[PDB]
Nucleic acid binder design. Structure first.
Ligand code: MG
Ligand code: MG
Ligand code: MG
Ligand code: MG
Ligand code: MG
Ligand code: MG
Ligand code: MG
Ligand code: MG
Ligand code: MG
Ligand code: MG
Ligand code: MG
Ligand code: MG
Ligand code: MG
Ligand code: MG
Ligand code: MG
Ligand code: MG
Ligand code: MG
Ligand code: MG
Ligand code: MG
Ligand code: MG
Ligand code: MG
Ligand code: MG
Ligand code: MG
Ligand code: MG
Ligand code: MG
Ligand code: MG
Ligand code: MG
Lengths: 155, 73, 120, 168
RNA sequence: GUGGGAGAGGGUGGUGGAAUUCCCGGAGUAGCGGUGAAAUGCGCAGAUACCGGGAGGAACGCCGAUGGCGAAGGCAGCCACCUGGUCCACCCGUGACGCUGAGGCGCGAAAGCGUGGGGAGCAAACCGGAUUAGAUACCCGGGUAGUCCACGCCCUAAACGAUGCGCGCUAGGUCUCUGGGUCUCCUGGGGGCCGAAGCUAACGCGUUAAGCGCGCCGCCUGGGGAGUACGGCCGCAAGGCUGAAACUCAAAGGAAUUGACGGGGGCCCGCACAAGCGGUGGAGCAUGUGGUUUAAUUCGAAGCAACGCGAAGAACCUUAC
RNA sequence: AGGCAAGGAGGUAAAAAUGU
C-alpha cells in the first residue's frame, strides 16, 4: 500500500470457456464466498443469452463488458475550497474491474425475480448499448467532462 | 548552466561610451528591450555599468527600445 | 451587419481570475470576444486553464463565422490560461501567424495593492 | 430558462412576436430570421411549448441581461440578515457579560436573529439555575430591542435561545 | 600640492518611456471583477477585453550584484549644472598643525502636524461584503487623511554591525568592488565569506577582531514598577529629551544542551487514508456501562489502552450487597 | 535529442474554544 505496487492476482481461469474475465465476473457476482452458486448463476445467464439473442454467450458478455468500460472517472481531491471532483483517466485492469462491478450492480438492480435471468438481461442490455451499467458509465463520463476544468490536478 | 556565447568576445573592439553607435548596442539587449545581465554580456563591472548608462541614453534619445514584444514564445 | 477580413489579431488577456480572448482586426478593432463567464463557466473555473482554452476556441469559431482565418496572437498577463488558450487557438485551424507577448509590466510604475506588495 | 435563437431554431413554421408586442402570426422561420436581421435584432423561440412555436424578435442578449438583473434583485431582496450566535458561559464576569450584551444589541440593530446559547462544560447539573438565571437577565436587559423568539432549549453541552428584533 | 579616477553622495533646472487611472474617439457585447470558495462591487445609460489620441500624478522595470556612495538618517530613469565627501599614484610642500570630544550648533527614515498647492495609484480611519462563536482582523470591494511637491515644525526607530571614534600591532586562504604598477603577479583603499593565535558564558568574533594595547567620550549597576510620575526644558499639538522613588518578586536574563512540541522542512512507514468487500449507526433481541431507581440494584474497569471487562457459567452457594 | 542545472513563471500552502 505504501512500500510496493502490490500485484494483481492471476485468477485461476474458467472451465466452461477457459476465460479469466469470466472467472472475474463470477467472483463479482458471488457474495458470501459461495462460488458454485454464483458460477451456476453465470452459466444460467449464459444459457438464457444463448436462448434469446442467439449468439455465443461468452462473446456477448465480453461485448457488454467492453461497452461499460470507462476511460475517465472523477477522483475526489481537495485543493482548497473543500474537496473537488477531479477527472482522470482510468487504468486498464482497474477500468475492467469497475465495469464488472457496475454490471453486477445493474443486474441486481433490475426488476425481474431471479438473479441469473437478471444477469443475462443486463448483459444483453450492455451489448445493445442501453440499460443500467451503460447508464452508470455514461453518468461517470459526464461527471468527467462536467469537471474537465479540474483535469490539470493530475495526481 | 548555459555555455553558448558572451557578447563581450562575440563583438569586436568597440566603444561602449558611444551611444550613437546602436547596431553595436542592440547586441546587449534581450529579445525584449532589456539590458542583458553580467552573465550574458560578460563585461567587467565598471564596463557593464558604463554600457548600461549608454543604453539608457540611447533609449532616451530613441535608438534602442525600452521594451519589446517577445516573439515566438 | 458583418464586415469580414480573413486576417487579424487575437488578444489574450490572461488574469488569474479569468481569461478573456478578444479577437480583432489587423489594426485592432474588436471583432468577437470570449471570456470565462461567456462560455458559462462562472466562478473559480472562469480563470482555470481549461476554461481559458474553451473561451479561445469559442472566439476562434466566432472569427471563422466572419471568414477570419489568419490571426496574430498577442498574449497579455500571465495566468493559468495563457498557454492553454494559445494551444486552443493553434488547434482551431486558425492560422496563428505569431505568438507575441505584451505583458503590461510597469517600468517601476505606481504602487500595487497590498496583495502585490510583500513580494514588494 | 434559455431558448433557440435564429439559426438554433430548426422547426419550419414559427409564430412571430415583436419588439414590444407585435403579433405577426405563424410565419416561416427563415422569414422571421430575415425580419430580425432587418431590425438588427434576433428571433428567439420564447414559447417552444406553443402552437407553431412562439418566437420573439428581440435583442436576446439584452433580455438575458435583464433576466440576470432581476435574479440579482431577487437575491439581494432575500434579506442578508440571519443568525448571529453568542455563546455565553456559566462563570462569566460582569464586564465581559456587558460586552456580549453590547454585541447582541449591535446585531439586533443590524437586523439579526440572535442564538444566545450558554456554553456548559463541567458539572452541567446546577446549570439551569445559574445558566437559566443568566439567560433571564440577558432577556431583561434587552426588553426594548429584543423580543424572545424562543425559550431556552438544552441540546448538547449547552442551552440555546434565539432572540428577535422588537420592531421591524 | 600635482596628476588621475569611482560612485543610487547632496541640491537645482530640465526631461523619457512603460504602467496605472481618467476623459474623449472608435470598434465590439454580457459580463467583468474578485476568491481558498464566495459575496457585495461596477456593467446594454454598453462595462470588461482591443486600438487611436489627450489629461494627469507618481514611481523609476531591465542593468542590479552577495555591488557603489554617504557620518548616519539614507540614496537608483537619463541629462545638465552647482557642490560634498573619498581613494590612488607622485613623495613635492607644511612641520605634530594630532586624537577625542561634556556642553553647543548642524543633520536625522517613517509616521505625525501647520500653511499653500497637487492628487494617478495606493491607502490608515471609515463604509460595504464575506469568514467566524464573535471579527472592531486577516480575505475581498470601495474610501478619507496621508502618501507627492513647496516652505515651516517635529525628532523618534530594531536611526542595528543591536559592535562609540581614532591610532598601533598580531597567520593565511578566499570572492568581490575600486585605484596604482616593470600587470598570467604585486601594492593601496573599501565590501563579504571561511579560518591561525588570542578571545568569548557560549554563540561566535577573528587585519573591517568582539584579539592584544593606548587615548578620549557615552553608558550600565537585578527584574517589574517605567521610559512612568514629579520637576525642568523643547515643540503649535501629538509628543520628545531629561528621569526617579515608594513598593514588589527571587528572580528577570543570555548562550547553548537534552527533550517535548509545531496548523516548520525532508525521508520513510502502518489497513492510516485512498481502491475494495463487508458491517456499526437505523429494527428487535443478547449482553456490558452511564444514569436513575432501590433495602440493596456489591465492588473494581474511563479516551485510544473502560464499556460480551475482572466473571472460563450470579436461581441457592457463588456474593463481596 | 536526452542529460544536469541555471533562471522566469504557473498550481499546492489558506480551515482547530468545551473535561476527571
Ligand atoms: Mg586633485
Ligand atoms: Mg470608450
Ligand atoms: Mg616631503
Ligand atoms: Mg622643514
Ligand atoms: Mg553632543
Ligand atoms: Mg513624511
Ligand atoms: Mg483601492
Ligand atoms: Mg467589516
Ligand atoms: Mg460583516
Ligand atoms: Mg481594504
Ligand atoms: Mg502635509
Ligand atoms: Mg524626521
Ligand atoms: Mg541591520
Ligand atoms: Mg539601519
Ligand atoms: Mg541603540
Ligand atoms: Mg560622535
Ligand atoms: Mg562605505
Ligand atoms: Mg580587503
Ligand atoms: Mg583557536
Ligand atoms: Mg569568521
Ligand atoms: Mg582577509
Ligand atoms: Mg566581549
Ligand atoms: Mg517614547
Ligand atoms: Mg511634564
Ligand atoms: Mg534562550
Ligand atoms: Mg478506506
Ligand atoms: Mg477497549
Amino acid at each position: 500500500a505504501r512500500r510496493r505496487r502490490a500485484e494483481v492476482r492471476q485468477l485461476q481461469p474458467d472451465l466452461v470457456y477457459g476465460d479469466v474475465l469470466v472467472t472475474a465476473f463470477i467472483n463479482k457476482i458471488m457474495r458470501d464466498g459461495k462460488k458454485n452458486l454464483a458460477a451456476r448463476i453465470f452459466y444460467d445467464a449464459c444459457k438464457i443469452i444463448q436462448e434469446k439473442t442467439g449468439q455465443e454467450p461468452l462473446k456477448v458478455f465480453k461485448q457488454a463488458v467492453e461497452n461499460v468500460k470507462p476511460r475517465m472517472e472523477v477522483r475526489s481531491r481537495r485543493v482548497g475550497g473543500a474537496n473537488y471532483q477531479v477527472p482522470m483517466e482510468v487504468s486498464p485492469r482497474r477500468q475492467q474491474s469497475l465495469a464488472l462491478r457496475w454490471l453486477v450492480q445493474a443486474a441486481n438492480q433490475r426488476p425481474e425475480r431471479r438473479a441469473a435471468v437478471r444477469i443475462a438481461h443486463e448483459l444483453m442490455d450492455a451489448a445493445e448499448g442501453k440499460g443500467g451499467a451503460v447508464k452508470k458509465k455514461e453518468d461517470v463520463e459526464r461527471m468527467a467532462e462536467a469537471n474537465r476544468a479540474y483535469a490539470h490536478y493530475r495526481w | 548552466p548555459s555555455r553558448k556565447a558572451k557578447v563581450k568576445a562575440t563583438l569586436g573592439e568597440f566603444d561602449l561610451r558611444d551611444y550613437r553607435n546602436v547596431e553595436v548596442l542592440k547586441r546587449f539587449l534581450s529579445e525584449t528591450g532589456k539590458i542583458l545581465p553580467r552573465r550574458r554580456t560578460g563585461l567587467s563591472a565598471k564596463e557593464q555599468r558604463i554600457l548600461a548608462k549608454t543604453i539608457k541614453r540611447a533609449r532616451i534619445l530613441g535608438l534602442l527600445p525600452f521594451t519589446e514584444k517577445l516573439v515566438r514564445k | 451587419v458583418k464586415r469580414q477580413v480573413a486576417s487579424g489579431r487575437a488578444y489574450i488577456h490572461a488574469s488569474y481570475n479569468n481569461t478573456i480572448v478578444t479577437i480583432t482586426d489587423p489594426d485592432g478593432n474588436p471583432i468577437t470576444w470570449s471570456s470565462g463567464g461567456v462560455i458559462g463557466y462562472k466562478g473559480s473555473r472562469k480563470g482555470t486553464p481549461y476554461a481559458a482554452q474553451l473561451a479561445a476556441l469559442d472566439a476562434a469559431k466566432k472569427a471563422m463565422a466572419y471568414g477570419m482565418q489568419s490571426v496574430d496572437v498577442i498574449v497579455r498577463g500571465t495566468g493559468a490560461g495563457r498557454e492553454q488558450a494559445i494551444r486552443a487557438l493553434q488547434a482551431s485551424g486558425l492560422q496563428v501567424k505569431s505568438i507575441v507577448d505584451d505583458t503590461p509590466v510597469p517600468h517601476n510604475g505606481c504602487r500595487p495593492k497590498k496583495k502585490f506588495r510583500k513580494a514588494s | 430558462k434559455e431558448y433557440l435563437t435564429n439559426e438554433r431554431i430548426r422547426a419550419k413554421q414559427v409564430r412571430v412576436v415583436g419588439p414590444d408586442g407585435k403579433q405577426l402570426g405563424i410565419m416561416d422561420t427563415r422569414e422571421a430570421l430575415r425580419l430580425a436581421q432587418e431590425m438588427d435584432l434576433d428571433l428567439v423561440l420564447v414559447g417552444p411549448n406553443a402552437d407553431p412555436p412562439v418566437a420573439r424578435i428581440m435583442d436576446y442578449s439584452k433580455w438575458r441581461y435583464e433576466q440576470q438583473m432581476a435574479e440579482k434583485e431577487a437575491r439581494k431582496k432575500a434579506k442578508r440578515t440571519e443568525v448571529k450566535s453568542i455563546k455565553f458561559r456559566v462563570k462569566i464576569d460582569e464586564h465581559d457579560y456587558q460586552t456580549k450584551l453590547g454585541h447582541i444589541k449591535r446585531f439586533l440593530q443590524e437586523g439579526h436573529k440572535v442564538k444566545v446559547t450558554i456554553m456548559f462544560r463541567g458539572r452541567e447539573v446546577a446549570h439551569p439555575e445559574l445558566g437559566e438565571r443568566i439567560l433571564n437577565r440577558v432577556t431583561e436587559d434587552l426588553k426594548d430591542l429584543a423580543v424572545v423568539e424562543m425559550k431556552p432549549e438544552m441540546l448538547g453541552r449547552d442551552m440555546n435561545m434565539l432572540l428577535a428584533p422588537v420592531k421591524v
